[PDB]
Design an enzyme around this catalytic site. Structure first.
Site, PDB file in Angstrom:
ATOM      1  N   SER A  23      -0.542  15.633 -11.856  1.00 29.91           N
ATOM      2  CA  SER A  23      -0.752  15.281 -13.245  1.00 29.91           C
ATOM      3  C   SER A  23      -1.023  16.547 -14.043  1.00 29.91           C
ATOM      4  CB  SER A  23      -1.938  14.326 -13.354  1.00 29.91           C
ATOM      5  OG  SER A  23      -2.291  14.101 -14.706  1.00 29.91           O
ATOM      6  N   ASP A  72       0.846  -1.190   0.000  1.00 33.27           N
ATOM      7  CA  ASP A  72       0.000   0.000   0.000  1.00 33.27           C
ATOM      8  C   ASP A  72       0.882   1.242   0.000  1.00 33.27           C
ATOM      9  OD1 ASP A  72      -1.937   1.890   0.302  1.00 33.27           O
ATOM     10  OD2 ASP A  72      -2.399   1.395   2.391  1.00 33.27           O
TER      11      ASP A  72
HETATM   12  C1  IK5 Z   1     -11.538   9.463   3.231  1.00 36.81           C
HETATM   13  C2  IK5 Z   1     -10.529  10.073   3.094  1.00 36.81           C
HETATM   14  C3  IK5 Z   1      -9.231  10.861   2.924  1.00 36.81           C
HETATM   15  N1  IK5 Z   1      -8.084   9.972   2.863  1.00 36.81           N
HETATM   16  C4  IK5 Z   1      -7.988   9.230   4.106  1.00 36.81           C
HETATM   17  C5  IK5 Z   1      -8.226   9.052   1.747  1.00 36.81           C
HETATM   18  C6  IK5 Z   1      -6.997   8.151   1.682  1.00 36.81           C
HETATM   19  N2  IK5 Z   1      -6.951   6.872   1.993  1.00 36.81           N
HETATM   20  C7  IK5 Z   1      -5.792   6.251   1.881  1.00 36.81           C
HETATM   21  C8  IK5 Z   1      -5.680   4.705   2.245  1.00 36.81           C
HETATM   22  O1  IK5 Z   1      -6.125   4.506   3.558  1.00 36.81           O
HETATM   23  C9  IK5 Z   1      -4.408   4.229   2.086  1.00 36.81           C
HETATM   24  N3  IK5 Z   1      -4.402   3.249   0.777  1.00 36.81           N
HETATM   25  C10 IK5 Z   1      -5.662   2.836   0.591  1.00 36.81           C
HETATM   26  C11 IK5 Z   1      -5.763   1.397   1.099  1.00 36.81           C
HETATM   27  N4  IK5 Z   1      -6.879   0.729   1.326  1.00 36.81           N
HETATM   28  C12 IK5 Z   1      -6.588  -0.491   1.746  1.00 36.81           C
HETATM   29  C13 IK5 Z   1      -7.502  -1.480   2.085  1.00 36.81           C
HETATM   30  C14 IK5 Z   1      -7.263  -2.790   1.701  1.00 36.81           C
HETATM   31  C15 IK5 Z   1      -8.164  -3.790   2.030  1.00 36.81           C
HETATM   32  C16 IK5 Z   1      -9.313  -3.472   2.738  1.00 36.81           C
HETATM   33  C17 IK5 Z   1     -10.325  -4.550   3.113  1.00 36.81           C
HETATM   34  F1  IK5 Z   1     -11.397  -4.477   2.273  1.00 36.81           F
HETATM   35  F2  IK5 Z   1      -9.750  -5.785   3.033  1.00 36.81           F
HETATM   36  F3  IK5 Z   1     -10.747  -4.330   4.389  1.00 36.81           F
HETATM   37  C18 IK5 Z   1      -9.552  -2.165   3.122  1.00 36.81           C
HETATM   38  C19 IK5 Z   1      -8.650  -1.168   2.797  1.00 36.81           C
HETATM   39  N5  IK5 Z   1      -8.926   0.194   3.210  1.00 36.81           N
HETATM   40  N6  IK5 Z   1      -5.275  -0.622   1.771  1.00 36.81           N
HETATM   41  O2  IK5 Z   1      -4.744   0.565   1.362  1.00 36.81           O
HETATM   42  C20 IK5 Z   1      -6.596   3.914   1.278  1.00 36.81           C
HETATM   43  C21 IK5 Z   1      -4.720   7.015   1.440  1.00 36.81           C
HETATM   44  S1  IK5 Z   1      -5.399   8.588   1.204  1.00 36.81           S
END
Ligand code: IK5
Length: 330
Positions: free
Chosen positions: A199, A35
């Site tokens: 971008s 991630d």
């Molecule tokens: C609202 C708002 C403002 N900002 C927090 C948005 C942002 N958000 C991020 C991450 O939090 C970081 N990169 C993403 C990420 N998501 C997951 C993930 C994987 C699996 C699962 C599941 F379904 F298995 F539970 C859930 C997840 N959330 N892994 O990385 C999402 C970076 S900016």
């Protein structure tokens, strides 16, 4: 040193990608979601509440001769989708594709939220954003990349995600056979802890290019491409029957449609996302309404170049003293 590991979609939609990671001695192999939008390496473990484990492989620190409790350290994280996890911390040996870090902080989950429990294919996350986002308290910990960086041949990692197919994460080198043309590098701001870049604009299908600055993050942990509402509306306006559905949570389109490509600018270069990459299939089994892979960032506060965009490119995460991002077509 270098490392190279294959990353594999967890399902037929490329909802996420998992990469095998060796933890501890003897190795315990867990499949982690790499991630670039977060900075914690956390795992399902022998400490995770039993009712919250449903088929994941767990890390058992008591069976690792190299594991050490990081005494007093806890962590707690919440992701953009509302999911969360928390627990305590061990240090242990972590290897990815032949690249080994000793003393890596391995955050052991005591609690995970329902979406993690419900995904039996994801054993945890390996954060690759900047270590300033790491949630370990009271002593913040470094990411796997941050710990490995000084030992690598070059202080870089690359993401080469596949479309409905496996891809590759490389550490410490650029595989010049993995892309076409040249890599265009673009400036990165670390001020928010992300691989944040601007971008230079976009095009829809065969249309002309619209020059406009789009600040966003390169995030391998986000499935979709989240862009300003103006851009997203211009895209979906080209698809008969496409509309934003509040009940579904985004733009949907008739599954009978063929989607136009979407181009994004990287400096003077262009990355073309084929239309098929934007099709995320029926909103529910058997539905003829399909979920779009390009969605509005309006409620998020930041644009996110997630997997939909990144899998159209070979992407260099350059962690030199002044970090940059590189994109090449492939
Ligand atoms: C609202 C708002 C403002 N900002 C927090 C948005 C942002 N958000 C991020 C991450 O939090 C970081 N990169 C993403 C990420 N998501 C997951 C993930 C994987 C699996 C699962 C599941 F379904 F298995 F539970 C859930 C997840 N959330 N892994 O990385 C999402 C970076 S900016």
């Amino acid at each position: 040193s270098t490392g190279s590991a294959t990353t594999t979609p967890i399902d037929s939609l490329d909802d996420a990608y998992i990469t095998p990671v060796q933890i501890g001695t003897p190795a315990q192999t867990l499949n982690l979601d790499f991630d670039t939008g977060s900075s914690d390496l956390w795992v399902f473990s022998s400490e995770t509440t039993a009712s919250e484990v449903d088929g994941q492989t767990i890390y058992t620190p008591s069976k690792s001769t190299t594991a050490k409790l990081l005494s007093g350290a806890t962590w707690s994280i919440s992701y953009g989708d509302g999911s969360s996890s928390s627990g305590d911390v061990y240090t242990d040996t972590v290897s990815v594709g032949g690249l080994t870090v000793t003393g890596q902080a391995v955050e052991s989950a005591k609690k995970v939220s329902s979406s993690f429990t419900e995904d039996s294919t994801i054993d945890g996350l390996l954060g690759l954003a900047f270590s300033t986002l790491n949630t370990v308290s009271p002593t913040q910990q470094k990411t796997f990349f941050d710990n490995a960086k000084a030992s690598l041949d070059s202080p870089v990692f690359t993401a080469d995600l596949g479309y409905h197919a496996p891809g590759t994460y490389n550490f410490g080198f650029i595989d010049t056979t993995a892309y076409t043309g040249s890599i265009t590098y673009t400036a990165v701001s670390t001020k928010q802890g992300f691989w944040e870049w601007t971008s230079t604009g976009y095009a829809v299908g065969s249309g002309t290019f619209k020059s406009t600055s789009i600040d966003g993050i390169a995030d391998t942990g986000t499935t979709l491409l989240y862009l300003p509402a103006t851009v997203v509306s211009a895209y979906w306006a080209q698809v008969s029957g496409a509309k934003s559905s509040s009940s579904v949570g985004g733009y949907v389109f008739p599954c009978s449609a063929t989607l136009p490509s979407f181009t994004f600018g990287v400096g003077s270069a262009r990355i073309v996302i084929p239309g098929d990459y934007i099709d995320f299939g029926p909103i529910s089994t058997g539905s003829s309404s399909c979920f779009g892979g390009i969605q509005s960032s309006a409620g998020i506060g930041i644009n996110i170049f997630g997997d939909v965009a990144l899998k159209a490119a070979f992407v260099v995460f350059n962690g030199a003293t002044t970090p940059t991002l590189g994109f090449a077509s492939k």
